[PDB]
From a paper:
The CHDL OXA-24/40 is prominently distributed in Acinetobacter baumannii and is characterized by the presence of a hydrophobic bridge comprised of Tyr112 and Met223 that covers the active site. Class D enzymes are distinct in that they utilize a carboxylated lysine as the general base in both steps, activating the catalytic serine residue in acylation and the water molecule for deacylation. To better understand the structure–function relationship between the carbapenem-hydrolyzing class D β-lactamase OXA-24/40 found in Acinetobacter baumannii and carbapenem substrates, we analyzed steady-state kinetics with the carbapenem antibiotics meropenem and ertapenem and determined the structures of complexes of OXA-24/40 bound to imipenem, meropenem, doripenem, and ertapenem, as well as the expanded-spectrum cephalosporin cefotaxime, using X-ray crystallography. Two deacylation-deficient variants of OXA-24/40 (K84D and V130D) were employed to capture acyl–enzyme complexes with the substrates.
A predominant conformation for imipenem was observed in the K84D complex, although there is some evidence of multiple conformations of the C2 side chain, suggesting flexibility of this portion of the molecule. The entire imipenem was modeled in the predominant conformation at an occupancy of 0.70. In both the imipenem complexes, the pyrroline ring adopts the Δ1 tautomer. A single Δ1R tautomer is observed in the K84D complex, but in the V130D complex, the pyrroline ring appears to sample both the Δ1R and Δ1S tautomers. The hydroxyethyl group of imipenem adopts a similar rotamer in both complexes, although in the K84D complex, this group has noticeably tipped away from Val130. In the K84D complex, Val130 adopts a “closed” conformation that positions its Cγ2 atom toward the imipenem hydroxyethyl group (∼3.4 Å) and atom Cγ1 toward Leu168 (∼4.1 Å). This “closed” state results in the observed shift of the hydroxyethyl group of imipenem away from Val130 to avoid a steric clash. Comparison with the imipenem complex revealed that imipenem is again unique among the carbapenems with the conformation of Val130 in the “closed” state, yet imipenem is turned over approximately 20-fold to 30-fold faster than doripenem and meropenem. To reconcile these findings, a structural comparison reveals a unique binding mode for imipenem, with its hydroxyethyl group tipped away from Val130, avoiding a clash with this residue (closest distance of 3.4 Å). The smaller and more flexible imipenem may allow for easier access of the deacylating water in the acyl–enzyme complex where no clash is present.
Residue numbers in the entry: 32 to 275
The structure:
């Protein structure tokens, strides 16, 4: 039916219409596909921002710094967003992208064990510097869209070097949507303290029949852009390609 020239044009147009520059990478089996209106972003490094929450949670659970039902208490200080002003589990923090919880979890892990775990997993440029609580927000940790989709593919298939149960626990935190028998698992990201600002949505689709299709959207966020544009472009793309 639909030519690949048309698929490429439809998906480029989604990014064009949002007046941003971005790419979305799809992986089917071993094969990577790059779509969007800025294909060269695919092998450029950007801060992972909140997408790091996935690995942060993996490391924390594996090293017994937390459990999946522990409540991280709000310390009562004003937060950037009122939705963060409450007690929550890692899983709720994952859905709300509650940075203060992931910061508390990074601190419990500590710089030393974090650096080793990040090197061990080979995540991005694997460099976390000297500040345990912000390396994924302002650098020096960086990662490419290709690396992110490969990380997602790894997690989707339990290939990261953590126990199966750790991986399963983190994955259950990432379920964001069901669409005609397809389950979408994803982590969003928005690096507000870098110039320019980077937007992420990294995840996979689990189809009815069990096949898992990893994706990673990467784009430039601009002042007065809605966060849900990351989702809308992703769903439109995955739908255009008949993945969902
Ligand atoms: C991670 O990338 C972010 C951190 C650097 O600030 C958080 C902040 C949110 S913005 C709106 C929050 N609403 C969530 N339900 C965000 C994001 O949308 O990814 N990531």
């Amino acid at each position: 039916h639909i030519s690949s020239q048309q698929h490429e044009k439809a998906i480029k147009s989604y990014f064009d219409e949002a007046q941003t520059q971005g790419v979305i990478i799809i992986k089917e089996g071993k094969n990577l596909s790059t779509y969007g209106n800025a294909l060269a972003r695919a092998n450029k490094e950007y801060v992972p921002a909140s997408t790091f929450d996935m690995l942060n949670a993996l490391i924390g659970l594996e090293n017994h710094k937390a459990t999946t039902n522990e409540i991280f208490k709000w310390d009562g200080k004003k937060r950037t967003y009122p939705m963060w002003e409450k007690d929550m589990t890692l899983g709720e923090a994952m859905a709300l992208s509650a940075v203060p919880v992931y910061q508390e979890l990074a601190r419990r892990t500590g710089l030393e064990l974090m650096q080793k775990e990040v090197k061990r997993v080979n995540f991005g440029n694997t460099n976390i510097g000297t500040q345990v609580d912000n390396f994924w927000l302002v650098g020096p940790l960086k990662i490419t869209p290709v690396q992110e989709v490969n990380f997602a593919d790894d997690l989707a298939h339990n290939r990261l070097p953590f126990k199966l149960e750790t991986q399963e626990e983190v994955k259950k935190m990432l379920l964001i949507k069901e669409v005609n028998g397809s389950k979408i698992y994803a982590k969003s990201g928005w690096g507000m303290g870098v110039t320019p600002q980077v937007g992420w949505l990294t995840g996979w689709v689990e189809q009815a029949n069990g096949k898992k299709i990893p994706f990673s959207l990467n784009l430039e966020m601009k002042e007065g852009m809605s966060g849900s544009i990351r989702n809308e472009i992703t769903y439109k793309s995955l739908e255009n390609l008949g993945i969902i």
